[PDB]
Design a protein around this motif. Sequence first.
Motif, PDB file in Angstrom:
ATOM      1  N   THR A  25      -2.008   7.336   1.735  1.00  0.00           N
ATOM      2  CA  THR A  25      -3.241   7.419   2.554  1.00  0.00           C
ATOM      3  C   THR A  25      -4.514   7.473   1.728  1.00  0.00           C
ATOM      4  OG1 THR A  25      -3.136   9.846   2.760  1.00  0.00           O
ATOM      5  CG2 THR A  25      -2.167   8.582   4.533  1.00  0.00           C
ATOM      6  N   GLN A  26      -4.512   8.229   0.635  1.00  0.00           N
ATOM      7  CA  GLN A  26      -5.636   8.366  -0.277  1.00  0.00           C
ATOM      8  C   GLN A  26      -5.828   7.101  -1.149  1.00  0.00           C
ATOM      9  OE1 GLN A  26      -7.445  11.410   0.765  1.00  0.00           O
ATOM     10  NE2 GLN A  26      -5.712  10.833   1.975  1.00  0.00           N
ATOM     11  N   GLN A  77       0.814  -1.208   0.000  1.00  0.00           N
ATOM     12  CA  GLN A  77       0.000   0.000   0.000  1.00  0.00           C
ATOM     13  C   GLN A  77       0.863   1.281   0.000  1.00  0.00           C
ATOM     14  OE1 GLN A  77      -3.860  -0.936   0.413  1.00  0.00           O
ATOM     15  NE2 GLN A  77      -3.309   0.464  -1.176  1.00  0.00           N
ATOM     16  N   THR A  78       0.789   2.127  -1.038  1.00  0.00           N
ATOM     17  CA  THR A  78       1.657   3.327  -1.197  1.00  0.00           C
ATOM     18  C   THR A  78       1.302   4.501  -0.268  1.00  0.00           C
ATOM     19  OG1 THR A  78       0.348   4.254  -2.989  1.00  0.00           O
ATOM     20  CG2 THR A  78       2.160   2.881  -3.672  1.00  0.00           C
ATOM     21  N   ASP A  79       0.119   4.504   0.347  1.00  0.00           N
ATOM     22  CA  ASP A  79      -0.224   5.412   1.443  1.00  0.00           C
ATOM     23  C   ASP A  79      -0.103   4.670   2.793  1.00  0.00           C
ATOM     24  OD1 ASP A  79      -1.341   7.146   3.320  1.00  0.00           O
ATOM     25  OD2 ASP A  79      -3.214   7.487   2.251  1.00  0.00           O
ATOM     26  N   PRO A  80       0.808   5.087   3.695  1.00  0.00           N
ATOM     27  CA  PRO A  80       1.015   4.436   4.996  1.00  0.00           C
ATOM     28  C   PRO A  80      -0.243   4.377   5.872  1.00  0.00           C
ATOM     29  CG  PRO A  80       2.154   6.555   4.951  1.00  0.00           C
ATOM     30  CD  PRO A  80       1.745   6.187   3.534  1.00  0.00           C
ATOM     31  N   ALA A  81      -1.164   5.339   5.741  1.00  0.00           N
ATOM     32  CA  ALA A  81      -2.390   5.374   6.534  1.00  0.00           C
ATOM     33  C   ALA A  81      -3.323   4.184   6.274  1.00  0.00           C
ATOM     34  CB  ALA A  81      -3.120   6.667   6.204  1.00  0.00           C
ATOM     35  N   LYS A  82      -3.106   3.464   5.174  1.00  0.00           N
ATOM     36  CA  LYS A  82      -3.879   2.283   4.789  1.00  0.00           C
ATOM     37  C   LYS A  82      -3.199   0.951   5.165  1.00  0.00           C
ATOM     38  CE  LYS A  82      -6.086   5.657   1.903  1.00  0.00           C
ATOM     39  NZ  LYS A  82      -5.681   6.842   1.114  1.00  0.00           N
ATOM     40  N   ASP A 137     -10.136  11.739   1.964  1.00  0.00           N
ATOM     41  CA  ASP A 137     -10.317  11.565   3.401  1.00  0.00           C
ATOM     42  C   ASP A 137      -9.760  12.763   4.192  1.00  0.00           C
ATOM     43  OD1 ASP A 137      -7.513  11.089   4.037  1.00  0.00           O
ATOM     44  OD2 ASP A 137      -7.707   8.940   3.736  1.00  0.00           O
ATOM     45  N   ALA A 144      -8.147   5.020  -1.482  1.00  0.00           N
ATOM     46  CA  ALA A 144      -9.475   5.046  -2.082  1.00  0.00           C
ATOM     47  C   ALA A 144      -9.601   5.920  -3.349  1.00  0.00           C
ATOM     48  CB  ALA A 144     -10.486   5.444  -1.005  1.00  0.00           C
TER      49      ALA A 144
END
Lengths: 600, 443
Positions: free
Chosen positions: B255-256, A495-500, B402, B258
């Motif tokens: 993070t985005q 996943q390239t966004d750490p928040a995910k 988000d 989605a």
Amino acid sequence: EELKNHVYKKTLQALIYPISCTTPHNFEVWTATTPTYCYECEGLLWGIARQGMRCTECGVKCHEKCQDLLNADCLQRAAEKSSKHGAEDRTQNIIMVLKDRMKIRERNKPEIFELIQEVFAVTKSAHTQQMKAVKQSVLDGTSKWSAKISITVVCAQGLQAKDKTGSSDPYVTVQVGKTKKRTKTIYGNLNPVWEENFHFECHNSSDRIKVRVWDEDDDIKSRVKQRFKRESDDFLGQTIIEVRTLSGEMDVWYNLDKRTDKSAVSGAIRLHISVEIKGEEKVAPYHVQYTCLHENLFHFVTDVQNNGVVKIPDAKGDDAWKVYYDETAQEIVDEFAMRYGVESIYQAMTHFACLSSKYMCPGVPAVMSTLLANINAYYAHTTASTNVSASDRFAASNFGKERFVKLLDQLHNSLRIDLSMYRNNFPASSPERLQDLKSTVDLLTSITFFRMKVQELQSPPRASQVVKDCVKACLNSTYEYIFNNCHELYGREYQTDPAKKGEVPPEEQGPSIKNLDFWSKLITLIVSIIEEDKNSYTPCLNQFPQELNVGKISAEVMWSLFAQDMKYAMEEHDKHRLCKSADYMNLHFKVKWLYNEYVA
Amino acid sequence: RRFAKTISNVLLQYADIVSKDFASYCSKEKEKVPCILMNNTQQLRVQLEKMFEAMGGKELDAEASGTLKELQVKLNNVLDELSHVFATSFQPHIEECVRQMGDILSQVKGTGNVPASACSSVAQDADNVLQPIMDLLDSNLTLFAKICEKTVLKRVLKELWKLVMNTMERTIVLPPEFLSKLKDHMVREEAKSLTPKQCAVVELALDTIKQYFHAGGVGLKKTFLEKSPDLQSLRYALSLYTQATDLLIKTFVQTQSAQGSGVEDPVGEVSVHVELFTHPGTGEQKVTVKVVAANDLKWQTSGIFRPFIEVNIVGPQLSDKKRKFATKSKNNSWAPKYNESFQFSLSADAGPECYELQVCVKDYCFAREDRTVGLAVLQLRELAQRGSAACWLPLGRRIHMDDTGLTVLRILSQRSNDEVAKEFVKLKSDTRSAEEGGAAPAP
């Protein structure tokens, strides 16, 4: 504990006067100065026509052909001969050379006696006093050693054929010094059972029990041969048991040895020998003592010196499987074994039994595989001149066939278990654990091969198949694991966004009806696993390249499990239709790709 | 069994009678009474354990034991509720306090270039900022530390700590008006970030609040406070306010996630074929993008439609790189074919999962302005598996986001001189110029 303490006293006695620094016999050609019987074969040495060899030092007398069968220590033989001839000053001089040899030994290699002391947890004081006591026990020579011996001649297996019939009529002569006795003859049988007991009195631990197996020729040719040679009853083989290698109630298969170059010899003789040694009553057999020594020494080296780590010895060549320890610990077991007649294959099967407990430890499966390939090669191949199956020759193992069979079965099961979680138990992030995995399988192969070759089993669980099942079991558990942890794993790895990357719900680290994203992520994880199997585990597990490909099996199982699940899931989505047409199309493209990449 | 029921009935009826009046005592003149009622409740739990043990403890009958274990858990929960109801009566005061802490902290800015009452030491500003809440905390926590039993105190303190941390997060670190003042359109102000000095001051006010709530071991364990998700969340939001442009942008892409799973209310679509090349000549990543066509463009315009497709790459370390391509335009064509192949470079360092394509259709308009028809995002994490993908990207009116995309964006918009941030903010803040087929999408 009672065996542990006695084994300690015997091991000190062995190593204070080791066989490796026994004096060699100085054999002059000798004309018998009185009518003499060869100390090894009991043939008459008399006159020029029946010259022997007389050792100057020990005054042991033998035929020339017999001088090399005398494993009797020259210095102890010298002390005994000097005693039996009343030469007391010579006896005491030999007791002084024996003392100097023991002082030399302690001075040169104190760390042996220290390691014995630590292996057996004895105090330095009780060690020094027991050391003084075993020095005296060696200087009792054999003037203060005596025994009763109860020799049950049980059976022989695999004897040679010497008759016109192509069989033999074997009987045994048992000789112990002054006294010769014989079994009854068993006719026409190469695997005779006697079960016959003789009693003997032995006043000398450097006497030898000469168990000679003979074909009972009562014919004219024997009555002719008797004039020229002393062994008319056509010699089938012998065992020459040194009386120092007797302890307590023994039950031992002795391979039969050649007496003369004209001897053709094959097979083994099972002898049950009870020995009642003065000052050593009710002691255990030296096999059991050696096992106890080796086990204590192993548990000391591994657990006590190395905190559990099995220190694999630096050892090479066809004798590497005979090296179990560093030099000092090696010399302990080897001098114990050599002094007390414990055959190298027994030592190996014992050490293999030790290693079988620590088989999880690094490199051990390689050593065990090697060791078992040697144990295998020993029983399988050694001497084709035998008329006995590898399984029957292995039933003549003094380790016990059964015991080793069970040992191998338990180990095979323990290997099956660990291989059934091979990913977890041998993580790809450790190459060494991959090599242990490889050697775990190589050991499983060696076991299956031992079952096939030594046990002569007609249908051993085929190693490739056993492993393939383990791999399947692991893959199922892997599949479950990923199928329960999908989001964590995917989040982290792609996943390239750490928040995910984090802990999305278990029902989304598992299947959802609302979104397909679990399946997409699961596919990528399935790929990651199949690739790890293709890339790490398939090269690791190349032993059966035509039967085991871990990447294929991974793809097949992972797709199968996935496909059943996906099929139910798509059926379920077909009912609900909560995700969009496009999403199922994208999933279809991914599944198509997955299938076509790895499964098609 | 018969008697355990008696116990349960009586003690729950006590707990209930108390719980029912509890809130009426949570008014500011009677703070002791709630503490005492909590202590009563807790004293029930204690005396009930005594009584459970006096009833033989482990040697009690299974249903009697079950009854009393049930009762003890229920009573534990009553105490948790009472502790929450108590902590809640302080919430308006904690909010007022934290708003005052916010009124004070607004006067501290990036003070290395501001007067010595606000370039007042990081400590003294933290103390000033804290003063509204420390009047509350010192008095109340010292009173509670006395009059609350230690179980009562710990529960009260957890409920108060959470309440403070969350209030500070909401009221100070992520004030909803900073949507308005640089996430949103409302004011052409630079908003003023939490400046390094106001990031400090707060981080120190927080360590002091943590020390206060720790109360030298009389309050909450340092370990609970450090592991506090409330604190960790507060620290995270704070960490964003100082983070580098590329790191903010990487954070946005990571993070985005989605922004790559179906546009809602599409305005057309774009056929692309895309080939990630982990560039066989270099081990960099290059992104070939064959723009094949667009279709169903909701743009039946008041003139000559002249669609072209801008393609943009997005992700970290792109300052030195061509971030934008465009197709030729096509006259009067709601389904324009292009067959045009572009080749972005990514960084060498950041993996494909740090990047996304943003595909924008625009009407070419000399004399006027080139109207955004629509926008699509493709996540290169997908292509990191796929290697090459044919896909029909549905086009949106604006990109869907988000809280963290919107937080990163309002942070990046304050970097109103950084050219990468300017172009990133501009690029994400591009939306379909509504007309010829509609204004606002779905996420």
